[PDB]
Amino acid sequence: KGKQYISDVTGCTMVDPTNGPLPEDNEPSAYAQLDCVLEALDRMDEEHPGLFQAASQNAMETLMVTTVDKLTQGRQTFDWTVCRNQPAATALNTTITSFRLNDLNGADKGGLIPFCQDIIDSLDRPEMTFFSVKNIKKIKRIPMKVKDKITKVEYIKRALSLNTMTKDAERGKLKRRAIATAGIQIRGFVLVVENLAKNICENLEQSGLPVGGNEKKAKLSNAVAKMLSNCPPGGISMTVTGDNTKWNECLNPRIFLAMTERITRDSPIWFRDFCSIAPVLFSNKIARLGKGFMITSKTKRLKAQIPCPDLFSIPLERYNEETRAKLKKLKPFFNEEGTASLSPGMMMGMFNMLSTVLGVAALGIKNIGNKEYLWDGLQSSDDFALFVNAKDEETCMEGINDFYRTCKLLGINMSKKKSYCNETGMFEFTSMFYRDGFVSNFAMELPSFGVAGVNESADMAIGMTIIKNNMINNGMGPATAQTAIQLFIADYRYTYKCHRGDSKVEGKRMKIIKELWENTKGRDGLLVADGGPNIYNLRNLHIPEIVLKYNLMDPEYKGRLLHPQNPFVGHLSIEGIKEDYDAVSGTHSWRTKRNEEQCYAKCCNLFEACFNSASYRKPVGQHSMLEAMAHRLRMDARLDYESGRMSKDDFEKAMAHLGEIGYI
């Protein structure tokens, strides 16, 4: 019911529900009025002096320091060069490489601002050259890099495009939904906007600093107690347990652009423009559609997948009724290249902090028309709980109705089927059930207590630390923790074929474990990986078993296990020692075999090998790595020659090689 037009930049069909007709029914509505959103944000600013300015300044200062490598953190990202989903590091380095071919060298400048500037610039280049994977049949399918080109419009579509899939392992829902991932072009801007939103929402008491562990219980208890105290004498306080489903489909990126503009009211124009790019790229987003439909004939026992670019090449009469109607309604927004323009709404997980800020702004109205009720609540990532204090149940229901209608004006829809109300003192929030001052969070599935699959020592340390952390945070009781220890030890013994030497189990490693069982006098000092007895209990979950058994180890067993020069340890395998678990180095500290990639890999491996410090702490310098490598190699060769560790011919060869490099 909004405004339908055609995007001149991309040619897609755009829909604008913002500032549209007010809803006339109880169906979901995206027609959020801008003036109402600005009213809510102005109220939020009034109740929190200088929170917007502080958050904007903090976000700007953190952005000035953030580097390009920060984009390597996250999950699978859309890669335009291959139009696929690839890890963040893969997509980032592919984009950096393909930008060099286009004379966009902002990545080499370090900081995130120049890289994002080059990302913005890339949208203007008349063409776009990159390296694409091409498979040749030589019969073997060999993939290689080919210098491919795409004109401007296709590149813009790829940059604005959002890859899609079906969310997996989403318990509590009968039917599935669509989860989406974005490319590298919007990653940095989204990062900055999310940092700004988090800075805002950590101060808000309704949302609170995003709480983890048992801070949720404290938040719920504080909210209930505060509301009950605020309740007038002889009045009634009612809690609404609310739940919005598909509430991100009625949230408009234009509204979020307005919120970003309002939040940064007093900031340099450069940061105001920088923070306005994620909403801009989300309002013009393109939704890549799955992998197509499959049509089969059973009189011929044939099947064939129809790629999405060819959805409408088949008469609609050859689809099932539901798919027929879906395609018939999708035709207006279908793009010839196999995508559908999706301007309104927002996919899950993109703007969580910003949406929470909007929800808290809705909560902070607290009243309508100076009526005899006050409402306040908690908001977090699509889940909200409301509390209304009034003088009777009728007035509380009037307040709840007013809150519902007000939320309709901001694009926030609450599920009437999933939301209910009762007297204050019993409710639920973020799958956490409060009742009479007792909170019963029982929706966090305890992670399967099995080996983390990194190596024996590290796996044992990780498992014990995980059990202890569960005890500390998730209210795990003593007996449950002990049973968790037992289950983890069972899984650990099963995975690594390390059963007690006195057991009757057989295997390749178990024969040697049995031998060690009797060849070793001190039997309680053996690590469990060596057939030793487990000695972990609640009290000693924070001390490595290598230390825990040091005094009981036999004189030779500790030496063998703790032999300073043993072959099962390599320096390059220590990168993951930190990420956090506390352990020790020993024969059980081995690594797994490996199942511009190799260029960077080998260059950095050599860099670390020459200087063992680069692995631990960032090196410092204002010169090429090659010259520093050459100089340190010269010093090493001279030291070896002086100390007799190297011969005259070896040093002569080293100097000849260095001159070949050109540093003599």
Partner 1 sequence: MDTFITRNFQTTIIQKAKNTMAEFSEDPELQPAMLFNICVHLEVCYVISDMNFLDEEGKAYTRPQYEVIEGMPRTIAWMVQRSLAQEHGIETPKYLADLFDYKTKRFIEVGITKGLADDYFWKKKEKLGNSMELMIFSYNQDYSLSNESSLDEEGKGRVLSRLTELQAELSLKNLWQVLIGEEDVEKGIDFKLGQTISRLRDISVPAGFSNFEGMRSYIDNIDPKGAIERNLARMSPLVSVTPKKLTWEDLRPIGPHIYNHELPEVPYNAFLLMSDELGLANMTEGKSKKPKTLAKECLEKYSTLRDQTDPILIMKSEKANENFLWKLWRDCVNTISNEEMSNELQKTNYAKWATGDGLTYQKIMKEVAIDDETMCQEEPKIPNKCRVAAWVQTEMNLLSTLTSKRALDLPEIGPDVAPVEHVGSERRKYFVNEINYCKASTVMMKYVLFHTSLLNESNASMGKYKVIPITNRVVNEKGESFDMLYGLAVKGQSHLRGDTDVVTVVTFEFSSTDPRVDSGKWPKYTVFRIGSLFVSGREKSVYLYCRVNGTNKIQMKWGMEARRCLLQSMQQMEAIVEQESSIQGYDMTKACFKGDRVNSPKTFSIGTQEGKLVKGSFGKALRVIFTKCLMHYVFGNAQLEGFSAESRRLLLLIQALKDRKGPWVFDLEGMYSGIEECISNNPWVIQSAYWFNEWLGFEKEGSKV
Partner 2 sequence: MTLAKIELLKQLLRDNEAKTVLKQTTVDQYNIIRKFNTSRIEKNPSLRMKWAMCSNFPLALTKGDMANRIPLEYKGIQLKTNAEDIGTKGQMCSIAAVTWWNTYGPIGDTEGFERVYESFFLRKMRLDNATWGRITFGPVERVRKRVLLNPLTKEMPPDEASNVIMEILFPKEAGIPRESTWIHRELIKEKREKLKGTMITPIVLAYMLERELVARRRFLPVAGATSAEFIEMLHCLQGENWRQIYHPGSRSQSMIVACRKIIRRSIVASNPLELAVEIANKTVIDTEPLKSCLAAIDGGDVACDIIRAALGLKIRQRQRFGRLELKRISGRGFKNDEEILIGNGTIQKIGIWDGEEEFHVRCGECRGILKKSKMKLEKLLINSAKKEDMRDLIILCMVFSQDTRMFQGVRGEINFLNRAGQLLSPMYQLQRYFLNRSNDLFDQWGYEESPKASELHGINESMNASDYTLKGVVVTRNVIDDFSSTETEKVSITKNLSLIKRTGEVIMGANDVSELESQAQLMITYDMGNAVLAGFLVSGKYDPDLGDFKTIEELEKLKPGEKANILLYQGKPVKVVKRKRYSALSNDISQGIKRQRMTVESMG
Residues 569-598 that bind partner 2 (CB under 8 A): 569-571, 574, 577-578, 582, 584-585, 587-588, 590-597
- Chosen residue from 16, 48, 235, 316 binding partner 2 by CB under 8 A: 48
> Is position 557 an interface residue for partner 2 (rule: CB under 8 A)?
yes
CA distance 406 to 363: 9
The three-state secondary structure class of 416 is coil
Stretch that binds partner 2, among 5-13, 139-147, 182-190, 470-478 (CB under 8 A): 470-478
> Is position 2 an interface residue for partner 1 (rule: CB under 8 A)?
yes
Q: What is the CA radius of gyration of the chain?
A: 31
Q: Which of residues 297-316 bind partner 1 (CB under 8 A)?
A: 297-307, 310, 313-315
Stretch that binds partner 2, among 24-32, 170-178, 253-261, 653-661 (CB under 8 A): 653-661
Query: How many alpha carbons fall within 13 Å on the CB side of residue 90?
Result: 13
Characterize the bridge pairing of strands 161-166 and 286-288.
parallel
Do 388 and 399 form a contact (C-beta atoms < 8 A)? Answer: yes
CA distance 440 to 443: 9
From residue 59 to residue 98, the character string flagging contacts with partner 2 as x (rule: CB under 8 A) and all else as - is: --------xxx--x-------------xxxxx-xx--x--
**85 Cα distance to chain centroid:** 15
Q: What number of chain residues touch partner 2 (CB under 8 A)?
A: 161
What tokens appear for 55 in the block?
A: 């958050």
The three-state secondary structure class of 570 is coil
Q: Which of Mg ion, partner 1, partner 2, none lies near 490, with the C-beta cut-off 5 to 8 A by kind? A: partner 1
If residue 439 lies in a helix (H) or strand (E), which one and from where to where? strand 438-439
Q: Is 530 annotated as a binding residue?
A: no
The three-state secondary structure class of 586 is coil
- Chosen residue from 140, 141, 233, 296 binding partner 1 by CB under 8 A: 296
Q: Is 401 annotated as a binding residue?
A: no
Stretch that binds partner 2, among 5-13, 316-324, 385-393, 617-625 (CB under 8 A): 617-625
Q: Is 247 annotated as a binding residue?
A: yes
> Is position 409 an interface residue for partner 1 (rule: CB under 8 A)?
yes
CA distance 526 to 463: 18
CA distance 475 to 213: 9
Query: Which amino acid does the sequence have at 142?
Result: I
> Is position 524 an interface residue for partner 2 (rule: CB under 8 A)?
no
Q: What number of chain residues touch partner 1 (CB under 8 A)?
A: 152
> Is position 614 an interface residue for partner 1 (rule: CB under 8 A)?
no
Q: Which of partner 2, Mg ion, partner 1, none lies near 273, with the C-beta cut-off 5 to 8 A by kind? A: partner 1
If one counts every other C-beta atom within 10 angstroms of the C-beta of residue 356, the result is: 25
Do 334 and 14 form a contact (C-beta atoms < 8 A)? Answer: no
Q: Which of partner 2, Mg ion, partner 1, none lies near 322, with the C-beta cut-off 5 to 8 A by kind? A: partner 1
Q: Is 244 annotated as a binding residue?
A: yes
> Is position 425 an interface residue for partner 2 (rule: CB under 8 A)?
yes
| DSSP type of residue 446 | P
> Is position 267 an interface residue for partner 1 (rule: CB under 8 A)?
no
646: Cβ contacts below 8 Å, ≥ 6 apart? 637, 640, 654
> Is position 38 an interface residue for partner 1 (rule: CB under 8 A)?
yes
Q: Which of Mg ion, partner 1, partner 2, none lies near 316, with the C-beta cut-off 5 to 8 A by kind? A: none
| Ramachandran class of 410: left when φ > 0, alpha when ψ lies in -120 to 50, beta otherwise | alpha
> Is position 404 an interface residue for partner 2 (rule: CB under 8 A)?
no
> Is position 506 an interface residue for partner 2 (rule: CB under 8 A)?
no
From residue 542 to residue 581, the character string flagging contacts with partner 1 as x (rule: CB under 8 A) and all else as - is: ----------------------------------------
If residue 324 lies in a helix (H) or strand (E), which one and from where to where? helix 321-330
Detail the residues annotated as belonging to a binding site for CTP. Answer: 177, 245-248, 349
